[PDB]
Symmetry: D6
Subunit: 169 residues, 12 copies
């Protein structure tokens, strides 16, 4: 709903993020191996406290339930571009929060970091997310062929993208 | 009258963090409303001896955390300092702005021995530029599209006040 | 069916230490049954980012610590990995061997994208070499007097299984 | 020709590399700023000596004249994919060398590194980069809109790729 | 002239820099104290070698003579702004290289660094400096009152500024 | 010949090593990538100067020419085993120095290092290598199936091994 | 009274010292800015644990109430001289403990460190302290003109002093 | 004369500084021990490169002959006051240079550093130090009793001062 | 009894080991000074966590009572030799556990580290231990004359020894 | 008889600190009665392995902290050591001096194998120089104005005793 | 003869020491591996500069020709005992030097170090090591069975000793 | 003579120091072992460069020849005492430079270092040393019995001492 907010990740939030980072199936559409020790994650978090090339956001409702995660990575201040990554948690999915949350990472990228472009990557075989993004104003700019090994085979992905004005206006 | 002003300590940091992740308060500082505690704590721990800033916490007599005030970029040759100010939204509209701005000019001019104090303020903050004008500040600057805030390029004033006019 | 497989954490380490100081279990790994927690903890803390190994903990649904499984010497050119396995003596003879070996080949072949998996197994372990044979492994090696264990020089098998045959 | 070879980027080759990373003409198509200290080149070079995620190639002829460079970067060892890029030094361009150099690299990635997918990012306003790349076998899979700011203004670039599949049989 | 080119500052140049930072005529016009040991200068360098908020340029002619120093400082990245500062060696002044070297500077920022605003601070009693900024398109936006104490007295400086739009177009 | 002697690897030799580790003909037969900067090589050295699980030998003739490299690696200490590897410089191949240099190697391990087992891995399609190990007393014990990807293709290698007993006696 | 003692400062004592270091008015006659974070103080304390150039003493009664602070700083073992600094706390002042406490810092400087001279600095505009010191045997040796910025203006101070014998005898 | 200039103390000037810090004649009035390693001079020099609390001046003539030094120390930026001291090398004393050197320093402190008060500590048994200092405008504000042990015995020193007030108008 | 086990020393075990390291009389037949701070010991323990040249074992019964300590030191993997050291605690002595425990350090040295020789050192004036060792298969190989200062005078000691087969067979 | 002597540990340090800030006890050691715990703790942590000193704590059977005894400047060539001793004022005049001095000479001569033990004692300590004389020590030194203590320059004795005379 | 002297092992003497620690003939009786980097020799040398537990002696003649070495190791300062060993460089063996060298060492240990017991470990298959050692006064106290693996096979060594007692009176 | 001057010890002098500390004739008379590597010497130096409890003097003649070494050690600061030690190079002995170099030494301590007591320790069987201290005003105050083991035997030394008063006056 409108109650949904975003907030900078925090050390208190690191069990909730670990639990999602070890879920084979949540992690399956992020193209990332489900194996992170709470030691490795914790330490990767600390090493990156001051890395200005990312914003990692924890997603919350009103009753203070952690809904999921929005991430901006690969922020380049020269070309003004960033990669966006969203995970809604197992217990918070199929509830209709996607549109909202995706739209606050643009709101953020665009109304705060003054970015020129946000781009994502999405499995053609997760053809629910691609309609979600479309319906937010993202257009397809590449059919990456056999990019990422997911689940026993090489799987294709769509690079999608929305520009700053487009969102802002 | 009941409003004291004292240095920033450690069990002050969850006050600061809170306000530091608020859009409607940070924008007025132009800053980005993203700072985790780790960042906050660690950046605190690195300036602990930096003699170029005075970070103050505003308290009442009941000792409840009223706001903060900063004297940043203190340059000891030209004796210039900037002044930013924040009242927590929960102590706004109480008539605390004038008192807290004068203690800040009272610390700068009567303790630090400074020559200039300067602030930057959003132009769209029309009931605020007055405040500082009303405290003896005068615009010297119309900054065209200094800060990108809330979707667009925006203008802020550079205002200024000297020891010569606050002490005299 | 009820057996999950997940990365090695910190409040896992008294499980590991225990088994790591057991003769009748370590010998089957050829290793020495001497490792204190300090050694264990500190060596853990030094490979935390080593991307050449995947150390997994076996749990049930009741979440009781069933065993561990390791993918060590992962070489990303030849895509070969070794596979060691341990079930705590208190979950032995329950019929857990096949399930846990297949999840290990399922992690190696379908997540890591590996070409080879290889294990070493005592020759005197005659109801075990079968197990892996029975899981699609085939001896390529009779290692003459590789490991000194339990008083004498002893032989182990080098067995192997490819992504080509586990996926097909 | 056949004289051209690739080898490990060494410490002594950094006054060669600095000079090309400070050239506006070369860099502005590599999409990176034409600015970098020898000190930023060498210290960044020292930080990455052990990084199994890249191979950095100084290209030489038969008389050891420094011709050009070749990177293979972002070397992921799950998906087995990398990014491939190439400069040929202003003094050795337009001599029919690019293909040998693309080939050698794809030979290295595929017959040695064992990668599944070599991909390159190429600008539309560089029509002979696109072309040479097609000749060598690369396929476009993308057209990225105003993805990089380059010389006054936002420009599109293409993505093009070959698989181990395609290169080891032709 | 067309022989003036900008290149990154280098260690082997840091003696030339040293001579301009310990000269009072030039550093007055930089609001900064003309005292800086070769060790401070060089330790400061090493300290800011990876620092993305500045670009420090040496200026060469055709014969590899050393001309001057262009700097872009406080490259802010949200707001896309830098402050521009310059020194033309004493021996090399009043040959009309200024405009071409303020030109090169506006070029970098706006064509490569994709910044919106270039801004400087120019001493009101250094009007030569004032009149070189105005022909390159700078506009006054602040009259900073008693900003710097210099040669025994507190002076005024002008903020002047030029925007990306106005440059290219 | 009797002029071939082993001595510890030295820093001043590490250029000679450098030339064999960046050569593809020789490193194929070492199951290892022919790419290694002088900095990796030399930083790796310093890293393993006190490390008791390897002995790294340079091989000299009478005239102090540099011949080759003998290594003993993974000197395990419970089980008394090492793996033996070798390279004879290209210029120095096929003069029949091999046996004497595999000989010296078996000598060290078994007479000074009191190891029980010497073992190697030899590329099946590098049979010259195979036939040099068998005359020095090595016995095959493994046919490692598709162990190394090399020149575009996954190959087989032989484990071969020789025991302390069989050497001395 | 005679019950008053002195004891080396200690980490347990650091809230009591902080509370005095942030009192504009206690700190006003010490010429020192009232702004020390409990972090800065704590850290300055640690950095100086072994600095033999100071003695920092906490002042206590019988019931274990912390009365104030006596400090010796700038101890020079060549000329034998030190600066003395006393603060009695807000809740312990106007009680007649000054004479006593001042006399145990001499007792200490003189009977223990074997110092030759103790000197202080005192605002002419805190003309209660100057009579206190006089009445302890301190004589005036300079009228420092406009030394220290206190409270909106430059204020004068008396350098005072008592020699070793003078005290000891 | 007018040829004399002050500049930043550099690494190369420390064999000049060592030699004066090891001279009993010079130091014994500066109140400091005539003993210090080059190693103690250079390592202490390295520790203080960034210290905004001091300015250390090598004085030179027109031919860059090393004449003397000048410190301004204890540079407090609330009270805006400092201590000022000066040696003139044994080979360039008694040539009428001291005033230029005091002036230059007071020019630096007042027209650049922006200090409110420059103070010096001078010995009674140095009557031409007291004198030169008066000529330049300094006022005694103190007479410190046996404040320093110097050559066998305890000696008094005076304190003398000028304000920015007095120097910028005369 | 047969219930007796050995286990790698551990940080929890360090009061029990300290208490024995400060017993003049237990430490008297170990030729070692009874003075180790729990700080020195603790720190010596940490420094040696990964030193492969020793095994320090804590001895336990069934009810989890710490019986004493067995130590292997000076393990040399080239000659295969080690020094063995046993202490049974004050409250666990004269109970008949010696034979057992000595025989598990051989069992360990011989069945696990694959050592060739274990040797000890024993005061001729502790002529109970020498019969204990004899009765375990240790033979005397030197009468060290006036080796170790124990209790006011230079005392002689027997170097004793048992070989691997001898034990194993 | 009931008095044991053992090494200095960590939960010993508030004993030591206490005595270390006492004038009437430290003076007899000539030392300065100023040492904070931080100094004490940290200097402890730096000599933990220094094999030139043995710092002992005196306990009774009831295990109450009776005093301390030190063997400092142990030189392993000349085999000389100094010996300082302190009984807490609350265990003084109990007749503990002789027993505790002999255990110290018993540790030095029969464990450390030392040749000399030497102590320095205030001359104005006339019922103490006797004590050590009475334990076999003999003045070799009248140190003129060694130590400044309690307002004035003062003399101390250098006394000495050898392994040759304590063992024989 | 009387020209021979011992002195502190210095940094410059390590290319002399390396060469003897890499000789199979010399080392194989010292019971240590004939293998060690200059880097392992120098870094181990750097780690032990302050170690009061050893004295390491380069032996020289009258013309400073490097003759041989001498260690005294495991220098315990309770029991006052040490291990003593000695090499004489292949080019200066069989010239009647060993005794002087053993003597000098026992002079150092007993008249300077003040040790109670100097002990050496000697191999049976070195009958003139045993012999020379007896001549100098050393007594066997042990015969250690197959204590070291040396040249293909396990060998026994003897232990031999002299006390300060015996050496300071003969 | 009047050409003998003291100056601080310097790194470039530390070879001269090296030659006196490895000479047995001279170090016997210093109660210290004539063995000290150039690395120990030079690492010890660096360690005590800021250390205020010693002054280490080299002694030069007019021609910059290197004469000897004067040291002041254990400069205690409460009690104002140092120990004085000296070496006159062998080549430079018995020319009557001693008194002037013991003189210079007493001069420093008492006129610059404001110490009350100079003390030394002189080997009873080194009476030449004894008779040089007595004419410079030293007085015996201790006969240290069997203090140092030297050339095979434990000797006696004299404490001798001289006071500030007696020097100047």
């Amino acid at each position: 709903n409108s109650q949904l907010t975003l907030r900078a990740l925090e050390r208190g939030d690191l069990r909730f993020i670990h639990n999602l980072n070890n879920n084979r199936n949540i992690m399956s559409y992020w193209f990332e191996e489900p194996y992170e020790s709470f030691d490795e994650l914790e330490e990767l978090y600390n090493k990156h406290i001051h890395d200005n090339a990312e914003r990692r956001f924890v997603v919350e409702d009103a009753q203070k339930n952690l809904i999921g995660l929005v991430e901006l990575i690969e922020i380049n201040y020269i070309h003004r571009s960033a990669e966006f990554q969203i995970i809604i948690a197992p217990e918070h999915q199929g509830k209709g929060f996607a549109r909202t949350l995706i739209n606050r990472a643009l709101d953020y990228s665009f109304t705060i970091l003054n970015l020129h472009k946000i781009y994502l990557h999405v499995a053609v075989e997760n053809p629910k997310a691609v309609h979600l993004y479309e319906e937010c104003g993202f257009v397809e700019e590449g059919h990456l062929v056999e990019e990422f090994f997911i689940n026993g085979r090489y799987q294709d992905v769509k690079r999608m993208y929305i520009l700053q004005s487009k969102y802002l206006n």
